[PDB]
Homo-oligomer: 298 residues x 3
């Protein structure tokens, strides 16, 4: 797109504030940002806020979201679809034109780990170019195993294809499949989908902890066979709904856009890979690391 | 197949009648019929009854089916495998030769949303050419959320490949992935797997309704990540068995041949896309639409 | 690998012995063995014990495994990762060099049907070359449907690609997808992943029996849509954990590395195919047969 040549819009922080006991404002951008998706490989991504996947959103079950998208792309319209919400797609997930803003309001009444993404046609193009992310909706009544959890992180799986190549997006194997982590608390890492950051700077934990991961496979195209090496998932909640309870899973199958809350115990010091067990995708980048120490520090 | 050149056998209605409190007759054809699978693209499908997927079958849990296949194909044998039934495959799902009929009897003792398909070797060829469909077996005791359901439809996902090309069937990406809808009640649409009909003539509902979809991904080859935009599934029953109960799912993973009953609420007027969230497949046709109005009429 | 040319190390029996009420010794080899994966097609597999998938391991929930790997490969290091155990990957799933042995100890505290595989980088290469298998951990309290089961077998699904071709492993479709069966009791078959053995010598059962299959799809890359023709799964336990209970499933979706215990009834004499319902994979070998007779004998 000639109007994207030489464009690299610096990342813009997510803005969020609570405006009532059950109402939250969220303001995001759609913007064009260069991201290093593998060593030496820049992708001029279509993004929310200059991150791909986009910034983490966390709200409470029952919150209505008053969402504003400010479209900084000079030429392509963009939009937002949160899987968390009940909305009219043709009124509430509609396009915002270049250099304009749009505000849409809708409730998040279901707990879980939901994908969000741009919903502008062709949606495959918008998602594959980087416009995907996760919104977590915290359950009003928690999860039954909350009291056992020592530490938590968010991981997202996505693919990258040949740059803005619709043929490849439709018909080609991914070039890269990757994990990123999005921060829940101060100090947690906040990374983009790339082949290397979570290898070189693993997530950290301490021997003996029960870890919770909030996970989503945003695709665009692949399913995920999510596995943590060296452990078994004690508890799994499909899509993050507390009802959807499995136990003792080695591997959790995620559809494209599928989420889960998974919990596992790390019993011994060392480094624990985190994969999709579709090992062609792991080989193409989808391995993160969890470093487990006697103190929880590096 | 030289004997199929210029053949286009007009669709034949399904014939079904109940012959006892727990016994039902079903008569289908195997026939060769031209179907427009994308605009300008005719596929000379191998079909049951001139539909691909084939006609909907609905029976009650505990019904024995006395099934007759009348093979109208001039040269290729065909057969029937219902996933609903307990049967001996090598005695009861056997070939019926051209211009002959066969009758086979077997019980449907399990509630759910089951694939049916031709079982003639090579089965990949028969299924990929169009010989697939759904049989619903209604549970004796219903589903626990029956009283909440306002409106229901059936949707089926399938793929289309290069015409009768076994190499492509085994080794190639689908050319199209599509939804069709099969009628449960008078007035409901009854369509073939194509890229466009359910976009141009959406399924209809009324604001505020709880909709139930009976869904099956008949493949032949792909899994499905089934999602309705703008909503969350309140309840999901895997394979349509009431026991297999999930709640609050954004997306339901279906294996090839996998079924489900899914229920969701449409809260606002507008048009709601229905996708597989494997967006390469959505881009290649697998998007249906649900139009939600203040009255339920267009 | 020049050092593998002309090497075909004869299969070595698994050695296992119980050394305490909750402690078991297991000794395996890593070795290079020719396996006929389709008629006329030899693959010089990287294996445990000269089998691919490797030999069945069965232990009890709560057993600590004292595992020794004796690496007979003349040039490539190998390792072992059991999904059943809690272990430090970087201390306990580490490489054993050519002509050396390593012993690692770790507990299996979770019941189920777990993948094991070599964990040496690149793991895709080790798994795709044949270094995969199943360990079953028997639940202390059994499964609720134990008393109904008449006969049981183990089946494993894997793929084969172009020989030791990392490009194909990452980016290509499988050349073959196959089932094998591993013996639980004297007399049961014990086979390698190939396109034909379980067609030509089906598993055997008797009319009216409830059969249990312990299944795992070891990949490396594909998901499985596991289905037995002519029946419905009465009960399914995902990953073999008794908690994860489904009923009345036509088809069970397995992620890569995913396991299950599935149970079904065979009501009539005949031959019952067992497939992945991703029919491109079935066509490329992934069909086993179950022959059901009035006596249970051939
Ligand atoms: Cu309140
Ligand atoms: Cu507001
Ligand atoms: Cu966009
Ligand atoms: Cu979506
Ligand atoms: Cu792929
Ligand atoms: Cu703890
Ligand atoms: Cu009766
Ligand atoms: Cu009759
Ligand atoms: Cu046929
Ligand atoms: Cu089938
Ligand atoms: Cu595909
Ligand atoms: Cu209602
Ligand atoms: Cu004891
Ligand atoms: Cu010992
Ligand atoms: Cu190895
Ligand atoms: Cu593994
Ligand atoms: Cu494949
Ligand atoms: Cu019995
Ligand atoms: Na308010
Ligand atoms: Na009768
Ligand atoms: Na001991």
């Amino acid at each position: 797109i000639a109007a994207h040549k030489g464009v690299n819009q610096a990342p813009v922080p997510l803005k969020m504030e609570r405006v009532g006991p059950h109402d939250v404002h969220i303001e995001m951008t759609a913007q064009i940002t260069d991201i290093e998706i593998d060593k030496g490989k820049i992708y001029k991504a279509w993004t929310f806020n200059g991150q791909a996947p986009g910034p983490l959103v966390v709200v409470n079950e029952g919150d209505t979201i008053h969402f504003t998208l400010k479209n900084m792309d000079p030429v392509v319209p963009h939009s937002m679809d949160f899987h968390a919400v009940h909305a009219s797609p043709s009124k509430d997930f509609i396009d915002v034109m270049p250099n304009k803003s749009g505000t849409f309001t809708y409730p998040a009444n279901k707990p879980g780990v939901f994908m969000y993404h741009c919903g502008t046609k062709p949606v495959l193009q918008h998602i594959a170019n980087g416009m995907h992310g996760v919104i977590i909706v915290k359950p009003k009544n928690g999860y039954p195993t909350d009291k056992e959890v020592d530490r938590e992180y968010v991981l997202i799986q996505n693919e990258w294809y040949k740059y803005n190549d619709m043929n490849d997006f439709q018909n080609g194997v991914p070039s890269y499949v990757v994990f990123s982590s999005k921060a829940l608390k101060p100090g947690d890492p906040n990374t983009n989908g790339d082949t290397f950051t979570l290898k070189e700077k693993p997530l950290l934990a301490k021997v003996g902890e029960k870890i919770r991961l909030y996970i989503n496979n945003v695709g665009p195209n692949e399913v995920s066979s999510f596995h943590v090496v060296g452990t078994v998932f004690d508890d799994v909640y499909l899509d993050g709904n507390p009802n959807n309870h499995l136990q003792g899973m080695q591997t959790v199958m995620l559809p494209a856009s599928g989420g889960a809350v998974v919990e596992f115990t790390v019993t011994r010091p060392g480094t624990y890979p985190i994969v999709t067990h579709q090992f062609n995708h792991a080989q193409k980048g989808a391995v993160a690391m969890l470093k487990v120490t006697e103190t929880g520090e590096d």
